[PDB]
UniProtKB/Swiss-Prot annotation, chain A:
Name of the protein this chain belongs to: T-complex protein 1 subunit alpha
Keywords for this protein: Acetylation, ATP-binding, Chaperone, Cytoplasm, Cytoskeleton, Disease variant, Epilepsy, Hydrolase, Intellectual disability, Nucleotide-binding, Phosphoprotein
Record GO cellular component, one term: chaperonin-containing T-complex
Gene source species: Homo sapiens (Human)
Pfam families listed in its UniProt record: Cpn60_TCP1
From Swiss-Prot, chain B:
Lineage top rank: taxon: Eukaryota
Protein name per its UniProtKB record: T-complex protein 1 subunit gamma
UniProt GO molecular function: ATP binding; ATP hydrolysis activity; ATP-dependent protein folding chaperone; protein folding chaperone; RNA binding; unfolded protein binding
Disulfide bonds: C351-C357
Entry binding sites for ADP: G27, G79, T80, T81, S82, T147, K148, G396, G467, E468, E482, K487
Binding site for ATP: G27, G79, T80, T81, G396, G467, E482
Disorder association: Neurodevelopmental disorder with speech or visual impairment and brain hypomyelination: An autosomal dominant disorder characterized by global developmental delay, impaired intellectual development, poor or absent speech, and brain abnormalities including hypomyelination, cerebellar atrophy, and optic nerve atrophy. Some patients have severe visual impairment, dystonic movements, and seizures.
SUPFAM superfamilies reported in the protein's UniProt record: GroEL apical domain-like, GroEL equatorial domain-like, GroEL-intermediate domain like
One GO CC term on file: cytosol
Residues modified as N6-acetyllysine: K207
Modification type Phosphothreonine: residues: T415, T444
Record-linked PROSITE patterns: TCP1_1 (PS00750), TCP1_2 (PS00751), TCP1_3 (PS00995)
Amino acid sequence: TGETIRSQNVMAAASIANIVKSSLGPVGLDKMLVDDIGDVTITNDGATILKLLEVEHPAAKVLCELADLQDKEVGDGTTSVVIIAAELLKNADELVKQKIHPTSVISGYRLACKEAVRYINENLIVNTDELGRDCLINAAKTSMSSKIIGINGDFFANMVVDAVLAIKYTDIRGQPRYPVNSVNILKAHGRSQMESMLISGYALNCVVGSQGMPKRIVNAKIACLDFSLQKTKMKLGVQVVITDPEKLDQIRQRESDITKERIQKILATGANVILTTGGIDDMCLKYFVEAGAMAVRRVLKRDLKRIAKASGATILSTLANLEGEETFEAAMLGQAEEVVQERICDDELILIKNTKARTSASIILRGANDFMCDEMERSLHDALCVVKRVLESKSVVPGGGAVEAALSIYLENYATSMGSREQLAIAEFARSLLVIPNTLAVNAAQDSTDLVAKLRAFHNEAQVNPERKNLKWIGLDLSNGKPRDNKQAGVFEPTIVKVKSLKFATEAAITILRIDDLIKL
Amino acid sequence: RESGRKVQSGNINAAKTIADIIRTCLGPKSMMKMLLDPMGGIVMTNDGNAILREIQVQHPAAKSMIEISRTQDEEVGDGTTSVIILAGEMLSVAEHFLEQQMHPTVVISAYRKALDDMISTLKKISIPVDISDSDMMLNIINSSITTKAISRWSSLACNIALDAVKMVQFEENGRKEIDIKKYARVEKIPGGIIEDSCVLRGVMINKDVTHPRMRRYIKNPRIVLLDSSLEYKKGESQTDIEITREEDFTRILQMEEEYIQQLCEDIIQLKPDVVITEKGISDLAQHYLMRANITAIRRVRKTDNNRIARACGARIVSRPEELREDDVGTGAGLLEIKKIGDEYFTFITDCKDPKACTILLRGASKEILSEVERNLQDAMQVCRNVLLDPQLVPGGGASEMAVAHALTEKSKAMTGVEQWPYRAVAQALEVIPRTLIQNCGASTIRLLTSLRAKHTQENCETWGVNGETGTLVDMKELGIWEPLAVKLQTYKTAVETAVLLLRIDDIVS
């Protein structure tokens, strides 16, 4: 209680932060967590694990919530804002121990939290594109598990990330944006690895039709079917007459003919290329093929809906209406600029090339290894997220870790003029900063000081920028840990996340710094 | 909430305390652990999978240790004892040093680089096999069943598995997996002798068939696997209220019976004398197949029907209107329900499916079969390892001391910090030959140095120490061998948890 609880709150902050440090980032290590009793789970990213963690304190409680707060914003900084809060509490509690009021301190901290962001506000880069975010290729190249992707380490990464940056992909009916909104970008190992290519069109894992289906139809409207045609089991729908044993089965043949009709009626209104999420029977496809329409059935829904949403008009994968077959109004038209079933990755797949009214591209990366398709998958998801933040925010700060050394100094500068106690209330606020290279270097088994100190020695004045890495800060590394530039390894941050993580730890700590008692009866 | 060096040492202490007698258990020379119970039940076993379950687990790493042993036990089941051996070693040898010398990762990174070096060294010392020659396999399989130490019945289980595994050998992902075990289907038969047990085309189903299931002998005529969409329609094309009352019987069965007619008359066209109904099986459905003049078979496992999709080798179709030989029951088919012993057994032969014979096992008893049965289940794991990896690699120290010098030279050529992990890893190898010398009853550090001299010159190509005879030996000449795969795999697995337990610095709740 009192200082003891404010030590116990620190001990709450201490014990917690000790873990999420070792869990911080990719260098952050997986950790056994006992989930109930005999349930123990090996994970990292404290915000993830803290939720399986059962706190011993409301202090540790509210902090998990704080990172969970941060998590609801973004899972990034969660482990940090926690780690930051521990730093904070340990900074000022000394002063609070010493001569200093818990109220007098957090002034020069919060207001420095205004100051640090005011630099993080005056620090940006609007072009996170060519120099990328954590370079451009290096986002994926790092996230590459380099097997056959490593020799393509720039190739794929420059391919995928430039694909991730912007390429042509029709969104639902083609809203233009960068295509991390959806990726029909795919991977299939086949042929060779260099031969992995972005494709102009739609990638489809599919059942391509048969039976006299045209294997390619250029410039074809589409029927994207969420449906499964099969046949509608009916003994009598049409021609009830009994004349030949031909006729009795010709009665139940009419489940097929009304389809055959409405297939051709769908042909007649329009499409030459048909995409069915489920199965169509051998006559259904045949109806398309005798209609001359290419029917690709059992089409992958995620791709197909992404196509169907992009396919134009309002289509059987965007339509729930099924009559047993439904003649189009040509507001049921899917659209493909030209339609190709092309061998890709030693695999012939239907490639919808763009949309008849609209434009898309995809990727199917040709590997020799499913393991290739296992990894650039992540590298996508990495670069996708990397460049997503790039794409919704062109405002991003250069460096994720180069800020700390500058910031402390930038605060050290801002400190010295504040005077009184709050010159130092800024300084200890700048002392909370310094764990960011540390847990990194620690999780990377690197010497934290010889970096962050060397970091603090990159300056003339304080800025993160590759123009002066000697006379200013720039960028960061993870495994070595040292600063990089931008396109070097050079780290960035989306300017949105830190200020929030900044904001939170500053505020959680002070309310942790709030109470001196915990009482019960 | 436990963490760090203490855990990092406790991880070893957890992991390493296991393997101690467990390594003596390795090899046919083996020292069984006595497991008494708090109940008092005494257990003498050389097999960790049994040892692992039965013992109090003192540490969550042991819980994690179980995982990768169960993994390999699930992965293959061969060398499960060996997967926990070198995992502790990597940890045991270096860990405390290099974390006192400060790093998880430099060892963690030096796990892989040591790993592929063996794999690279293996594929040189692992030399291809004749799968064309069953005996070129069989001798290993014989070496494998003498590893299982039954040469009496299981030498036949060798052939039966081998002959089967060569037949259950097939698969295509487009990368074309060599074997398929989930195709391989044994039988368990009392009566007959396991020498009279054999393998025939397709999946023999004794699994649902111990008695009449599909007639008896359906020679050409088909069996019909049903993934339809056969459910008798309460109405005609629509489902209506269920039948609680006479009117519901009259009106609805009117609409029901004609639909199964609409269905199983589409069945009668594919020439079944038998129709095994996995889906759509209901009081009306199979009732109409006798009205469809075909035997109907009720509420059956699709596991069979998928095995059966590998037996007659067909697919199964949900198509209500289209039901055919190619759709279900491909090939001419042979459906034979034979009573072997006292139990009627469907044998689906005339396989249309690549190679694909499955195993008749008839023992004079279930038990006399079982001794074949387990090693035949072991031989198939062995055979496929020869199939998956057709490079036979010499067992023991020959494959062991070989990689070590590479790793050392590797470490020495790297001359970084990771040298020490490789120096740890290369030395981590030497335990098993030492253990074999430990096991055989000779002086290891002599034989170790002796085996070093076997590498210093020969490179220990075929030369390890042979734990049975406890001597420097030619494993080629001995015929001591094994597939690279399980050698790789079990080893490659032994790497993994050492990566894990070194990664994991925090054990919490």
